[PDB]
Amino acid sequence: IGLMKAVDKFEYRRGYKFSTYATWWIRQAITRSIADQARTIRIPVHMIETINKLNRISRQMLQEMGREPTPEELAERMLMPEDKIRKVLKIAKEPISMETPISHLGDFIEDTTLELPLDSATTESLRAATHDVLAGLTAREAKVLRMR
Amino acid sequence: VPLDGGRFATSDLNDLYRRVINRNNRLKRLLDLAAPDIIVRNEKRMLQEAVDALLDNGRRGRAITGSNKRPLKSLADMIKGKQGRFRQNLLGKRVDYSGRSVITVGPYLRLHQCGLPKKMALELFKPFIYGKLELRGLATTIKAAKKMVEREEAVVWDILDEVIREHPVLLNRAPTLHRLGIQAFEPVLIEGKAIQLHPLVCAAYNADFDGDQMAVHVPLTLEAQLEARALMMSTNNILSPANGEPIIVPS
Amino acid sequence: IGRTTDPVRMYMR
Amino acid sequence: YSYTEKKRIRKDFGKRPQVLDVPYLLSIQLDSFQKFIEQDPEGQYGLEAAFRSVFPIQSYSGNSELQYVSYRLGEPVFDVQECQIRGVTYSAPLRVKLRLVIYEREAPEGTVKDIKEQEVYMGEIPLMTDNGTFVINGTERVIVSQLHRSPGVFFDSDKGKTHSSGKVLYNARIIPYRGSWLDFEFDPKDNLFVRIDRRRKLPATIILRALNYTTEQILDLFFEKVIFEIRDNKLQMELVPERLRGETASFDIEANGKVYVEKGRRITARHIRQLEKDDVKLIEVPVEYIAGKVVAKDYIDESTGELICAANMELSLDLLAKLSQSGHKRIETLFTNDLDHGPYISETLRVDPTNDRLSALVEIYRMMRPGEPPTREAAESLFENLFFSEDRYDLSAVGRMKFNRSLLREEIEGSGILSKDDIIDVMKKLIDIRNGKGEVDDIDHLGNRRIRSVGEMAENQFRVGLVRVERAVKERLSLGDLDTLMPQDMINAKPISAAVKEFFGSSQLSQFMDQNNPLSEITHKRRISALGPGGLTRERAGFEVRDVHPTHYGRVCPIETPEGPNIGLINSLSVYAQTNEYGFLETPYRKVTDGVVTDEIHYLSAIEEGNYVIAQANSNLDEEGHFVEDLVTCRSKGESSLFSRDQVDYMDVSTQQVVSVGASLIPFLEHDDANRALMGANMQRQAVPTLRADKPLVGTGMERAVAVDSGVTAVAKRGGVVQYVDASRIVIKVNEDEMYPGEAGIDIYNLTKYTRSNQNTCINQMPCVSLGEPVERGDVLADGPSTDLGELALGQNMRVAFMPWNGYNFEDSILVSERVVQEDRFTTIHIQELACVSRDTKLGPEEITADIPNVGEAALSKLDESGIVYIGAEVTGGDILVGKVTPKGETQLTPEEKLLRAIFGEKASDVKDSSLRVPNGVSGTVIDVQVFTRDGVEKDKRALEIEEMQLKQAKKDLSEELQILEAGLFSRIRAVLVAGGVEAEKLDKLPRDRWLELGLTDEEKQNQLEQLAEQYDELKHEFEKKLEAKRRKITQGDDLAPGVLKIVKVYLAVKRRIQPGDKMAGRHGNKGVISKINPIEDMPYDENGTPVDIVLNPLGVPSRMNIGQILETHLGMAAKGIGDKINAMLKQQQEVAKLREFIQRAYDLGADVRQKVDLSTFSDEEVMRLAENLRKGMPIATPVFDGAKEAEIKELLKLGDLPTSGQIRLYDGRTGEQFERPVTVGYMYMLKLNHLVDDKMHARSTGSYSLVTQQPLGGKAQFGGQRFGEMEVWALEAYGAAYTLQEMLTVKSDDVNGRTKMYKNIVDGNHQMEPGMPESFNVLLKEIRSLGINIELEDE
Amino acid sequence: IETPITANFREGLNVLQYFISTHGARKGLADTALKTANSGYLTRRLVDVAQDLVVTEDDCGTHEGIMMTPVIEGGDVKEPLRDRVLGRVTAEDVLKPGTADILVPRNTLLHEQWCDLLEENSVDAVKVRSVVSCDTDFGVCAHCYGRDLARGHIINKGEAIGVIAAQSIGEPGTQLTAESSIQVKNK
Ligand SMILES: CO[C@H]1/C=C/O[C@@]2(C)Oc3c(C)c(O)c4c(O)c(c(/C=N/N5CCN(C)CC5)c(O)c4c3C2=O)NC(=O)/C(C)=C\C=C\[C@H](C)[C@H](O)[C@@H](C)[C@@H](O)[C@@H](C)[C@H](OC(C)=O)[C@@H]1C
Ligand SMILES: [Mg+2]
Ligand SMILES: [Zn+2]
User: Where is this site: Interaction with anti-sigma factors (chain A)?
Assistant: First the structure.
């Protein structure tokens, strides 16, 4: 697709070879597609650029300083407030498959949106007790309380 | 769903659907752009391959999962196999009201009795104890009964001894070769952590006391209790269903 | 031809 | 005798003298890794090998090179302790020197400019501990060795199943270390076919053609010629009488006017002999005979110039006439026979469709890459890269050795790639095997199987990393510019480090260390394994790989092997076994001269061992190395039989060399059945260390080796005198003989107090010496977990009786007394770790406050102000350890809750409760707490207090070390200052500091003193630097995963007692589960009123024939009797002479044994100490196949005044009457296996449910329901139980509304259900409908 | 091997004898380990084939059956007629060696007493009803099935006999794995 665009937007008057222009456009398209549709949870292009720059700087500092670049060192080396670094480091992870061997990782995932039977029984008991107590009161007063 | 620490777990079906959608959208874009026929044919072949891998993966080239080498799990792989729905969930469910422990000898028992530890009995029969506590007026509300059971008061033990009276339980050993691997006994509350098995039923169970374990289930409904008492009870199964010979011979 | 199944080889051809 | 050895001497039976001593047990791991690191000058095994293999990296003739100079390993940032505590790997940085040279274009080669980049950092390699373990992510690990098939060429048979008509189909295989497999084979038609690694079949001659061979050359290579000439008529054949054997003569074979062979008579041996003696070379035969031959080379007519006949063409009368007329008088034919020389290659050529090299190459290419058109260049390149390229193919040094030895070559060295000669030789050998000559070889032979270890696999991973890096660097160098880039930016350590980390962290051979005992670790470190990468599969092995081959004698233990799915696929290593220089196992033998058995040891592998005749370990000798009796049993070739005295070549070096350590720790092993010996050896490693470990009364003598070789004990490095003993430290003042010139100094040993092992048991060391006690080099100074005075003590020995007791030992179960539980004989300490993590949520961060909603002061009693439990607190299930609250909001409560709130005016909390609590059923004591706080977070009070304690402790430790070493160094300084003028008075009066300050008038001693002062200043500076480094390390931040703010870890120490349901065992495969705890006054007692500790069933011995336990019981009774005699003699304090006499009498007491004890011991101190240590029973030693006999046991029993029968009279505790039939009583050493009943009980009624299918979450950490498989469903269907089954699979598990309603009904007192339909069926319907199908539910 | 182990366990075994015995020991262990799974698979197949067979009737009124006789092979009888016929129901009336004498009537359950009575006389072959020849469609009837049970009476209407048959067959699976002249050995 990138090459089709390049061929559409080519000018031979300049006298250059089509190869340079076409390769430029092709590389642009390939990198754009990789950025756009390579992750399960999509992230914008500028976040991708920031992550790539951070990785390059980290590799350079690891090679030059021996052991490893700590987040404070990355923030100082860059021109950023040392917190956006933490956000970027936190938002750059990939999901894990549920079929991973362990048995599979998906057999230990719990359903946390369910209601315990004891809690439902307690709610029913409270409903009954409140009905009894309201019946204990007067008629119009009970109706007013129910309406409110 | 999210995992503790911000990591996510996902199913392969999401990956397969995403690939199908991406290829379909690209094909639409190419068709709307009047591209040369070779590119269109390549896109059509790619979409065919993507859909075929979605439906039943592993018939052409077994597309492998990203960040891994394992092949993806398609729709047809979930239905079939020894780990599919039919054999793993639709015939082999896990159940509530059950536990297990190690088995011991207990030679003083009668042929229809089994020793059951107090802790296992309390955990297995909690709701019955809540009902009894509320009925007798000891606890005003179900939360009060829950707290009383947690604190392990004496009235709790009396109520348990009353509710365990004539309620049979089922005992099961791991390899259930024939129908005598399940039988029903009448629990006797004991102190300890190992179940007590009458010596005479060991041959039928094929059990020895060198590390074996057993599972205990509770029949809830009233028809279930009647079936346990009239069909599976340990004093009803004396003859082998394969041949009429007795199966309670002293060993 | 050898009746290949790989789309990559076909496209390359 | 050594000191720790003379404290308590084990009476040793056994008559065979020792010639070889057991080696260091953990030599495999250490040797492997040392070879891996192994900085060596010449390129061989190590990192040097890989570095020289890859570099130098040459561009695409770009006139620039990157070349290797040397390498070095840095120093680890953290030692083992910090790595374990924080949770990082223990490794060292790798620094490499690289030189980059660029050549200018274009002129004669010269050094235009070479930039010498310094120490490019290339990944990190994990290091090995002193004992053979790795600390990968804070956890110790072991890399088990792998037993895999060695590279080479192997000929098989494929007998039987093929075609169900016999006709064994031979084949050959070439297995390289790295490359694609080559294969040849036959078929029922006798056509030789070739298969590339696993592709489709091809005629074998295609590969020969692709090697630039024509049909004539192939026929010449694979056949012998028959010379023909027409000497004026009737086809005057040239004949060799040798070839005529095994055939029937069809004509009159006559020569020299004589008829040697007459028509109708088959040639026989006599005819062949006559022909050979008469030298008959030429005869005349009819044309009909030659009508069936095959021509070798093609023929053309010189006059006509046309191809009259082609090579490999069946002859005929017309062809023969044409050849004769065309002027041809000599025609060559192939010598073919139906017995010795079959024509397989000719038939294969007949079936071969290819004709030239190009067609054969195209055929190969079309086979390898079907579907794409072939090209000449591509086909040539593919074939060249297949086997003849040094990059994609390499056999080995070992592979080449095996390849040469299989083809009978005299050279064991060569290239790592194939050639024409190799393939031709393999084909020739396969054909020879087909022709009845030669033999196939078995795959299970230990001469065909090879062993890989840590160093080899680590080097392979590093080589993969280097290949990736080299490809990347070459591409960048060739593409980009090469004038300014330094040799630091073109290499990325990420791939190399990734490969190594991937191997060491997630692999099937890097395993979580097994750490129940010292024996568990020793056996884990010496483990072979046929599984893993490049190995077998558990489900796909067969009945042959897992068998005891005759070659395992002395190399692999035949009894110690797991009993589960993988039996015969682990094979723990033997005792004396080693590894060849190539990876093959070898064992030692004693060289036998003419008739004298010498003492020189030779290590022989399986191939070498096959040739010689090896005598037996237990063969009598008489003080001159002469075989007493003439016919000595031996074993020559996978078999054994009687041999003459003057035929033996070697002899076994010991009687233990056939077993492993675990199997060699079993006394009386020759009386035990093989199955039970296997079971006992397997169980011995699961024993859990006790509160007090005593010893085995009946052992085999391999205990000290296992105790010392394992690193649990603390062993002295240099001799000296114990100067300070404490529960936590030992200080040794070295002898004057072993001190170095300077730095007098002292040895300090820091003991390891209560710590958690991998399996949650307890690790502890306690001092084994006293103040002012001499210690020699190699002595034991502190006992580890489950050792006693340097010996291994896994269990405890107890008084048993063999008799039935009222059915409480009916099956394998056991009956135990109550004095066994009062005395805490089997009480064990377990340690758990619990962690509370404070993360960052979207609503807000979590807190570790001590204020929790709706929690009374009872729960907060044990929590300090910061909200963390105190140390030393005793907690019980449900208690709070760390307080924590999580933010929450907008609950949106129900109307009735709103009315209740209005009536009572109750405030709703905005913070949840997520604190850490002790698990139910566990009660212990808090013994430690650790806090980790992310950098940039305020430290609570507790963290500050902990770090202040840590800093004070570090300063005190450094100060104490310096004070001890400075006392030693002041003694040294006194010694040195003695010279240059000896003045005792000055030393007595002058202070220590003033000694160096004083200076002489003038001499080199003044310069020496100034140098000493400067060095002392430097040492002060260095010590201050070390203190500063310690402080900075302590107070630094913590590297935590993203999103975590704090982590708090709490350690609980539990005390497990013995209760019914716990599993115990002996050393002879006798298991059991405790059945009861009988009071003291109910157990059977003897005439003296002493009860019996344990009662075992006699019915378990006959069926399973482990007679070792009875012999052990008898010998234990005898040993305890001797101990009791000594104790009674010592209570009344008779005199030293009586003790000396009785102990000597007990020690001699043998039948030609090799003990040889005093009198040489100290006057009374040593004898009294020995008697005090023996008053609990004299220990015995019984080697595996050289132990005691019945007569000696009876003599020992008689010495102690015990019945020689072994049986006594017992009385009933309850009735008081005596049992008839005397019962067998004695002492047996029993173990407590780690199958505790506290860890097995489980039960639930309701809990959490799975996510997709709403079913209870099976497991134990979560409650989880018991699985009700389909076999149980069949069991319930066999009855008529429809309601129980329906509720079991509807309401108990999967119906949601049914679940809730059933719970409510049970609470209300009504037992009835509304079944409904399960959710898994709905999920199934949805999943099947998400295909194209349309499945629905009808109604009618 | 051509030389035996001449030593028992009361005496010791030297190295060679013990090494020789380890072969058979490991062979037996592995054999059991694999035969377990083989038997499991076979029993699963058996239960799947015939899981839908139930006793849906009481008597189909069939007049045929199978002829039951002792399995006498060679010079010995491997199974007496009493064990082969006990429990079944006679397809047709059984006549003793003396003709016209109806020893036992038509279809009637044969309990211990009738089997002893047959043993008393010279009854040799008796025809019984088998489930293979049952006329009932969609199941079998109690009479064509017989009696055998953990009980002692006739089978009840509504019993799942296919699962019982499969389980009974597959349970003991784990325990499985010239003469030119003929002479009479009895007068
Ligand atoms: C990556 O490690 C795994 C690799 C799997 O991959 C996989 C496919 O390739 C494997 C290789 C190359 C093996 O050599 C192996 C093995 O030698 C073994 C068991 C069977 N183990 N047991 C199962 C439990 N049961 C109660 C007892 C028997 C195995 O399954 C394997 C295995 C595999 O299965 N047997 C023993 O080692 C013996 C004679 C005693 C056991 C001692 C302790 C108990 C273990 O050593 C514990 C400490 C762990 O070390 C292992 C469990 C490792 O698990 C961990 C945490 O790392 C496991 C090797
Ligand atoms: Mg058992
Ligand atoms: Zn019928």
Answer: 148
Cα–Cα distance between D1223 and D1210 in angstroms, integer? 7
Name the residue type at position D459. Answer: E
* Beta bridge partners of residue D101, listed in sequence order: D65, D114
Buried b (16+ CB within 10 A) or exposed e, D1050-1084: bbbbbebebbbbbbbbbbbbbbbbbbbebeeebbb
Q: Answer whether the bond into residue D106 is a cis peptide, omega within 30°.
A: yes
Measuring CA to CA, which residue among D1192, D1205, D1068, D1169 is closest to residue D1119? D1192
**Annotated resolution, angstroms:** 3.1
Residue type, D416: G
Q: How far is D38 from chain B (nearest CA, A)?
A: 35
| B67 burial level (CB within 10 Å; 0-12, 13-18, 19+) | exposed
Question: Is D193 in contact with D184 (CB distance < 8 Å)?
Answer: yes
D562 CA closest ligand 1 atom index: 39
D1042 alpha-carbon distance from chain centroid: 36
- The number of the ligand 1 atom at minimal distance from the alpha carbon of D142 is 50
Q: Which residues contact D452 (CB under 8 A, 6 or more apart)?
A: D145, D146, D148, D583
- What's the rounded Cα separation, in Å, for the pair D476 and D289? 72
Compute the count of residue pairs across chains A and D with CB atoms less than 8 Å apart.
Answer: 69
Q: Six-digit token pair at A133? A: 């107590």
Name D638's Cβ contacts closer than 8 Å, sequence gap at least 6. D550, D551, D610
| B244 touching chain E per CB within 8 A | yes
* CATH topology assigned to domain A38-113: Arc Repressor Mutant, subunit A (1.10.10)
Burial class (CB in 10 A: 0-12, 13-18, 19+), D198: exposed
Residue A76 C-alpha from the chain's centroid: 26
DSSP state of D400: H
Q: Which residues contact D607 (CB under 8 A, 6 or more apart)?
A: D447
C7 CB neighbours in chain D (<8 A) are none
Examine residue D1159 and say whether the peptide bond preceding it is cis (omega within 30 degrees of 0). yes
**CA-based nearest residue to B60, from C9, C5, C4:** C5
**Long-range contacts: D129-133, Cβ < 8 Å, 24+?**
D129/D80, D129/D90, D130/D711, D131/D26, D131/D521, D131/D710, D131/D711, D132/D26, D132/D29, D132/D30, D132/D33, D132/D525, D133/D513
Q: Which two tokens stand for residue C11?
A: 């496209």
Nearest to E22 among D548, D1187, D1275 (CB): D548
Q: Find chain B residues with C-beta within 8 A of A94's C-beta.
A: 67
For D840-915, strand residue ranges (E) read 874-875, 880-882
Q: Quick one: which of D224, D226, D219, D221 has its CA closest to D349?
A: D219
- For the four alpha carbons of A44, A46, A49 and A55, in that order, the dihedral sign comes to negative
**Method used to solve the structure:** cryo-EM
CA distance E124 to E106: 17
- Partner residue facing A111 (CB), from D488, D900, D1251: D1251
User: A62 and D77 in contact by Cβ < 8 A?
Assistant: no
In whole angstroms, what is the distance from residue B99 CA to residue D1242 CA?
5
Listed in sequence order, the DSSP H helices in chain B are: 12-33, 37-55, 75-79, 85-88, 118-135, 142-151, 154-163, 202-205, 222-227
Alpha helices (H) in D337-492, listed in sequence order: 344-351, 357-368, 376-387, 397-406, 420-434, 454-479
Q: How far apart are CA D1311 and CA D1290, in angstroms?
A: 15
Q: Nearest CA to E123 among E148, E90, E145?
A: E90
* Cα separations in angstroms, B152 against B121, B123, B147: 13, 12, 9
What tokens does D928 get?
A: 């430690």
The rounded distance, in Å, linking the Cα atoms of D258 and D241 is 15
From CA E58, how far away is CA E62, in angstroms rounded?
12
D1092 CA to centre of own chain: 42
Q: In terms of CATH, what superfamily is D828-945+1048-1055?
A: RNA polymerase II, Rpb2 subunit, wall domain (2.40.50.150)
